[PDB]
Symmetry: D2
Subunit: 287 residues, 4 copies
Amino acid sequence: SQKFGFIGLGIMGSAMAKNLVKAGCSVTIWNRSPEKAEELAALGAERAATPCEVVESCPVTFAMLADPAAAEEVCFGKHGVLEGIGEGRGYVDMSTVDPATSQRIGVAVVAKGGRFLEAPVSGSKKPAEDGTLIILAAGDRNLYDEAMPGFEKMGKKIIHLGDVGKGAEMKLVVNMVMGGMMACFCEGLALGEKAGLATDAILDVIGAGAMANPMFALKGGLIRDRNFAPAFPLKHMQKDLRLAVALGDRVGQPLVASAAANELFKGARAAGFGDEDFSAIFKTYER
Amino acid sequence: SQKFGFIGLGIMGSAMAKNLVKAGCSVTIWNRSPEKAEELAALGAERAATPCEVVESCPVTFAMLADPAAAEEVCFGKHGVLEGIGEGRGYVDMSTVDPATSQRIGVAVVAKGGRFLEAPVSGSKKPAEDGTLIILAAGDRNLYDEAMPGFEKMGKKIIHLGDVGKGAEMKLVVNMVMGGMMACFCEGLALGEKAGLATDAILDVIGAGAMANPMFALKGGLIRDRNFAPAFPLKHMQKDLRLAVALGDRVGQPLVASAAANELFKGARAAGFGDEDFSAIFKTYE
Amino acid sequence: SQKFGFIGLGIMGSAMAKNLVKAGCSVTIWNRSPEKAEELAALGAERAATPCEVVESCPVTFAMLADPAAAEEVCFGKHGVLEGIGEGRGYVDMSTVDPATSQRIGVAVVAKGGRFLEAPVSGSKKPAEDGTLIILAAGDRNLYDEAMPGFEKMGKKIIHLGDVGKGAEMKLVVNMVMGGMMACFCEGLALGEKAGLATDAILDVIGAGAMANPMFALKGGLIRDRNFAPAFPLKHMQKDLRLAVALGDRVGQPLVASAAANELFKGARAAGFGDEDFSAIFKTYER
Amino acid sequence: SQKFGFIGLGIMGSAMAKNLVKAGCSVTIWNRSPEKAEELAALGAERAATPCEVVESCPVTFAMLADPAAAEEVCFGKHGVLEGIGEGRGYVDMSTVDPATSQRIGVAVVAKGGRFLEAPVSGSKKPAEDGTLIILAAGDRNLYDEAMPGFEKMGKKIIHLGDVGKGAEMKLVVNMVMGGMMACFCEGLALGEKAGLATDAILDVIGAGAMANPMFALKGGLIRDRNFAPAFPLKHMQKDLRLAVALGDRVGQPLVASAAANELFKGARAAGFGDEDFSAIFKTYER
Ligand SMILES: NC(=O)c1ccc[n+]([C@@H]2O[C@H](COP(=O)([O-])OP(=O)(O)OC[C@H]3O[C@@H](n4cnc5c(N)ncnc54)[C@H](OP(=O)(O)O)[C@@H]3O)[C@@H](O)[C@H]2O)c1
Ligand SMILES: NC(=O)c1ccc[n+]([C@@H]2O[C@H](COP(=O)([O-])OP(=O)(O)OC[C@H]3O[C@@H](n4cnc5c(N)ncnc54)[C@H](OP(=O)(O)O)[C@@H]3O)[C@@H](O)[C@H]2O)c1
Ligand SMILES: NC(=O)c1ccc[n+]([C@@H]2O[C@H](COP(=O)([O-])OP(=O)(O)OC[C@H]3O[C@@H](n4cnc5c(N)ncnc54)[C@H](OP(=O)(O)O)[C@@H]3O)[C@@H](O)[C@H]2O)c1
Ligand SMILES: NC(=O)c1ccc[n+]([C@@H]2O[C@H](COP(=O)([O-])OP(=O)(O)OC[C@H]3O[C@@H](n4cnc5c(N)ncnc54)[C@H](OP(=O)(O)O)[C@@H]3O)[C@@H](O)[C@H]2O)c1
């Protein structure tokens, strides 16, 4: 009987909101495109007209938006979060964004009388459905504690990393490694294909060794079957590497391999695989 | 007892031969630098003076050498394997090498009337010691069978990938992926550090998600502790990336990311870390 | 006598402003660090306390600032350009900046009653002293024409590329090539030296052939002299490549080589060479 | 009057040999594909059956072959140079090859009692036709002096760089820079196009500044015209980059930018552009 607001109902946000509804929470919902909202309304969610409406009437609102532009627009725009937020009500942006953007939103939220937490996550569509996300929160400690029962229905591992920005930083670091791994993994599979190796043979050897991981296992088979249905949209992976490179720029860390990965994913977007899974980068190598 | 030869007693070869001796094989050994052969001798292994002498004396001889140049010198060089091979005696080269190299060696061995099998391995120093290596054999099926009692004491998973060259291609492909992973893992750890995150915090997050793997777990802890004692020598990792990139060149596959990792490992070599663990590339981002 | 304002007196701006004074113009100037104004001051230039003061009192003001942040500060900041412009007085920003910020600045200036023109330049310290800069202007065509007497004393080739943003786009494209050229040039020299080749011999062979250019001729000589006094500060070259990569991201162009150059220049900054000439990247390839 | 052998009648060799024939030399020629000898044959050149036959009968023989594999097959193979050289007759290999290959050949040649000089060249099809090549010789000085009358009909600048290997190293260093700069140049034109800049405007701004060079000027025009008729075959550019990166590996020089260019040229080969001009790499940058 806890009440939560939820803003942004894409791949990740849709499954997360549904987990709050399945858990018995009363959930108030908003999405720029109505159709996705109409999906959860049918499940028992309450549908709000604007972001303003959601945070105007919910003690704690989660948001799961595409990128900094989306997060900023929803926050600062007409009928946005800033218009409805206040009197201690909390805004929890779980979108992957740059530390400067979450910090910017946090300040504005706090100036309106609200509280702000950032909580980017690790784990894709399936972990979102299963409620097994890893939640990387940073910011208001009281809001962290208050949002916890919500977090616990969305994730398995929930941590607090300190001041606003540290969560974004953790997320960007972790995803940079993932993007890099995926680029290299695909180069291996493509090279193997051209060398005359069977994919399953390669997958079998990797699976038996020190590099074995769930991501290689999952994506390996999907690549073999040439199924690139989006779990983590390729255009979002590229956005994340974009942000990781800007973080590197700011803190003075050269990132030769991760910058290469950024460019390769840009190639995949240009090729038209932007709305496909990020594993679709394999098709640029092949092709 | 079963008689085996063993050529090349570095980190890997030393640990492998010791398993053969431990299992009660009668092992004849050779290394370029004789000090490395002293430890095995003390365990009962018989020292030969040249590779030619090991291969003269043994029905099956394994080799675990640094690189293509090493493999070729031991094979084609004065008093090398070729001078001693014959009468169907078998040479099983387990060095990590390019396909052209192992094929060239096998052709020459077969021409001398010997049998040839390539068998590079996956798994590092600890797996070598424990005998839990993954063995990626390719070549003569009958020599594969004959070496099997040895393979079983050196490894836990043994497979045969087809014609000579297939073992080398598989090995290069998987190590290329590993080298890239290490490079990216390290960029992440150094970026996180400069952003002000705790190394243990990053490690924990990674260990909890879809990327988690034994390599990151072990190497992450050693990076945190600044311990870079060689398990897989950085110079050999770089060599493997070199070979992978050459293979890409031969089969018409661009490898932008893996080529970048190759150059970053070359940077680590130039900084003086070639004899440390390949995880020492981390220090170049530092 | 013709009167111009000038904002930002670094390596470029001070040289360009000197040319206007030498041409006989009455010049009003300003720099964040007032000490740098002292030389032009002795030359007859009148010193202003604020950018606001400069644009208050001049028909046309040129600016030559480090980067988008600096250009944004001077424009929108306290006592900035915005507080001063109006009644048709022109602002010509010659800073190297991304298309979006020059547009954002233009709209702001124009909404204040002022006129805006961007005009980034190509050519370093010596061309700036010699008045042989290439001027890549875009924006208010009328301001362009009134600015000409000034352009013609600062540069040799002056062109108009269309709407605000086109100048910046041309400038970033050209500098991206330059940065990538410098990185490849230095890799060659360092490789040559490590192979035991005399680097003067290398420079002679390049100079004799199809890729010979003034940049290689000069910078090669300086590298040989071990003279890295800044003509184009390395930190600014890195900034330009950063902006070029962002442009790539935006227009959907993967930039594998250029992105690599960006990272290599970041390494040069991490190594402490940011305030040396961009050719100092050579020292990262070495010793 | 002079008698010369010539081996390898590809794009460069046929043009070089014609210059010796036009100069009144008596020239004995050989090519793996004998039809490439037909034009020279009608010009009075004498057909040899095998490389060994050329080197049996000529005091000095030049070779202009594709790559290290070709150079070695011609030297060490059946009916090869080694079968025919001796009694001080000279072999001048002008192929672009790695130092260890040319040294290998030279040692085997000297063992047969012949003399050896490597002399790779800088300058493409047009300079080969005009006799305007830069010749980078290394090795036997007496042979250098003996071949000079031939070098003088084939090139304009002729230098001697020391022992065998120095010429190869110089050639590889210089070509590495040229390959990276082509890659960067093309990234810039492609980026500019996608930003809505006209390519002629970009060309004109570059040609006015410090980067201007004959290569950009020539290739820029042909890119604009989408004319990629081979002057320097793209597969050979890629082979040179391959060899330069291996040189880097051997002498302890990381080559981040140059290795990137190597991979991009590989991409162009994979798209089927291997036999077009190396400027065809541009076509991989724009679908
Ligand atoms: N997918 C994953 O595996 C995964 C994992 C961890 C983190 N993330 C992060 O989660 C966030 C969302 O990812 P996703 O995979 O769910 O993305 P998605 O399926 O593409 O959905 C993106 C969401 O953002 C909304 N949006 C975009 N621009 C907007 C704007 N201008 N105004 C209002 N809403 C806007 C979209 O609304 P519409 O429906 O109207 O288009 C949609 O709800 C991203 O930051 C992503 O990086 C994703
Ligand atoms: N270490 C690992 O985790 C790992 C894992 C899988 C595969 N491998 C592969 O296993 C092989 C051996 O690696 P390692 O880790 O054991 O390396 P190592 O400790 O460096 O030993 C390499 C061996 O090669 C020998 N060698 C080098 N050059 C030679 C030459 N010219 N002539 C004769 N012998 C020569 C060395 O002889 P000296 O003792 O006289 O110097 C030594 O016995 C390599 O191909 C490596 O890539 C390594
Ligand atoms: N140098 C070249 O060869 C070259 C060639 C073409 C174009 N450019 C471009 O021209 C522009 C100027 O470069 P430069 O070489 O002259 O650089 P510079 O010597 O380093 O100085 C740049 C100027 O920007 C000012 N500045 C930096 N941050 C500021 C801030 N926050 N608020 C107000 N002013 C600020 C500096 O003021 P202070 O004196 O107080 O530090 C200085 O006046 C840059 O965009 C550069 O990329 C340079
Ligand atoms: N083109 C340029 O702008 C330029 C400039 C400077 C240097 N170079 C270098 O000059 C050399 C010649 O190249 P090119 O431009 O003239 O290329 P090309 O037209 O492709 O000629 C290659 C030559 O090599 C021969 N060849 C290849 N493999 C052979 C083999 N296995 N056995 C015997 N002959 C073999 C070819 O014989 P077939 O006719 O039978 O195929 C042909 O004569 C190359 O090293 C190239 O890198 C080129």
